[PDB]
Design a protein. Structure first.
Length: 174
């Protein structure tokens, strides 16, 4: 799962949306309602799509999300990038790393200086997106932090992975 402060990208009614995850959560929770879960709460979706990567052939495609989800955590990992951005995520959460191949590694096993997989985040926010490419990013530093707050997951039963507007590739995890 990821922090409520995180920026996100999605599409519905043939148009893109780009805002903080807590803002799209508050929109969908006001439209469709919030349902209970064992470990937290969930919001059901309809015709909501995101960019997803085929890890097998490295091909770019679009997939549906099933529901939004949230739960509570005290302990989170912050990973800083050479771009000046930071990824704030649970110690369990697999990130797409590069070591001779595309590999899913939990933030607790991520170390400073490793390669994160993504795409040009400026190109991802143009009117026409120059498709069929990817971009590698350097980890600046890592640390364990006290969040004590609600964290999200945006669920994809097709592939279990999606891309954020900041270019990075994410896996579904608690």
């Amino acid at each position: 799962a990821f922090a409520r402060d995180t920026e996100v990208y999605y599409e519905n009614d043939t148009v893109p949306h780009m805002e903080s995850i807590e803002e799209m959560y508050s929109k969908y929770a006001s439209m469709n309602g919030e349902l209970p879960f064992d470990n937290g709460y969930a919001v059901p979706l309809d015709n909501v799509f995101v960019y997803t990567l085929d890890i097998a052939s490295g091909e770019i495609k679009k997939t549906r999300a099933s529901y939004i989800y949230r739960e509570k955590v005290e302990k989170l990992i912050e990973i800083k990038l050479s771009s000046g951005y930071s990824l704030k995520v649970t110690p369990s959460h697999p990130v797409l790393l590069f070591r001779d191949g595309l590999q899913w590694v939990p933030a607790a096993e991520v170390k400073p200086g490793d390669v994160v997989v993504g795409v040009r985040e400026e190109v991802l926010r143009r009117r026409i997106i120059s498709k069929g490419e990817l971009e590698f990013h350097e980890v600046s530093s890592v640390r364990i932090i006290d969040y004590n707050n609600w964290v999200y997951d945006l669920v994809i039963p097709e592939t279990h992975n999606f891309i954020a507007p900041n270019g990075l590739v994410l896996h579904n995890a608690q």
